[PDB]
Amino acid sequence: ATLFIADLHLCVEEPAITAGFLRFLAEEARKADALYILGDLFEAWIGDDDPNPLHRQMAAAIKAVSDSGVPCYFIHGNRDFLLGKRFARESGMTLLPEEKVLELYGRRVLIMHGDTLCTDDAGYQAFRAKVHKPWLQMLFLALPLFVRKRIAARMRANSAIMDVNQNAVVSAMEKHQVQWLIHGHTHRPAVHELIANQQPAFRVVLGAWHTEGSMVKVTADDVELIHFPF
Ligand SMILES: CN(c1ccccc1C(=O)Nc1ccc(S(=O)(=O)N2CCN(c3cccc(C(F)(F)F)c3)CC2)cc1)S(C)(=O)=O
Numbered sequence: 577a578t579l580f581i582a583d584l585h586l587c588v589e590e591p592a593i594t595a596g597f598l599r600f601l602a603e604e605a606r607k608a609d610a611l612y613i614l615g616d617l618f619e620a621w622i623g624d625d626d627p628n629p630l631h632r633q634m635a636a637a638i639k640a641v642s643d644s645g646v647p648c649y650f651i652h653g654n655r656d657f658l659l660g661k662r663f664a665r666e667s668g669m670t671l672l673p674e675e676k677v678l679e680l681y682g683r684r685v686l687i688m689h690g691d692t693l694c695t696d697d698a699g700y701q702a703f704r705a706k707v708h709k710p711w712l713q714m715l716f717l718a719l720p721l722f723v724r725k726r727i728a729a730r731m732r733a734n735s736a737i738m739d740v741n742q743n744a745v746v747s748a749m750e751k752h753q754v755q756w757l758i759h760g761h762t763h764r765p766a767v768h769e770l771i772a773n774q775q776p777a778f779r780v781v782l783g784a785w786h787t788e789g790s791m792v793k794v795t796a797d798d799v800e801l802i803h804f805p806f
């Protein structure tokens with residue numbers, strides 16, 4: 577079975593999520609064929625050099641999973657788009673592109689964070705357009721940690737998540753010719769039915785973690801959205 581999670585928003589002052597993720601890693605993920613983390617693993621990311629002890633501990637925990645024989649893959653979310661190759665090495669994760677098609681037990685499944693589907697949110701898409709320019713990322717990362725942190729305090733006070741655009745959903749699923757899509761971002765967990773490629777299709781939406789978690793579990797038999805206790 578292949579597992580998908582997203583929208584953990586890990587944060588020092590949300591210890592229930594930290595504990596729940598550590599358990600998931602030790603119990604569920606160790607038994608999987610593969611683990612995919614579809615963005616917003618962290619509440620915020622200002623660079624791989626951040627000395628936050630949470631990052632040390634979470635990297636070692638994820639790396640224990642891939643070091644055990646279970647590959648771990650990451651797609652960036654809007655919160656953690658700066659997570660880079662240094663932290664990918666620390667955590668034993670492979671970084672994926674924005675959109676990726678998997679072939680799982682016969683079935684072709686598109687995965688993404690989901691923010692690129694929220695095409696009606698003008699402010700968000702403008703924000704996203706700038707902060708994804710490599711040259712600008714390199715300048716922000718060159719700033720001192722304490723400056724990066726003050727900037728990030730503003731930007732989060734300043735920032736209710738707009739839901740996906742249906743034309744964007746269908747366009748992505750027809751571009752990749754898939755009948756299955758898994759994403760997060762919107763924090764509205766559900767299995768939706770729709771039409772893509774003039775056939776039945778499914779859009780499976782992960783939930784954010786707070787007092788419990790969610791995963792999608794993919795087997796040859798089934799695609800299941802599972803909501804599970806800490
Ligand atoms: C859907 N979200 C939004 C909606 C509208 C507008 C923005 C967002 C959004 O994701 N905001 C948001 C995302 C991440 C963060 S952060 O992790 O604290 N941090 C903030 C500092 N960032 C940064 C700022 C300028 C240039 C560059 C650079 F590029 F130079 F590195 C990077 C790096 C990321 C802070 C704010 S929401 C409601 O969750 O906040």
Ligand SMILES: [Mn+2]
Pocket residue numbers: 583585616653761762763784
């Ligand atoms: Mn999220």
Ligand SMILES: [Mn+2]
Pocket residue numbers: 615616653654655689691760761762
């Ligand atoms: Mn998001």
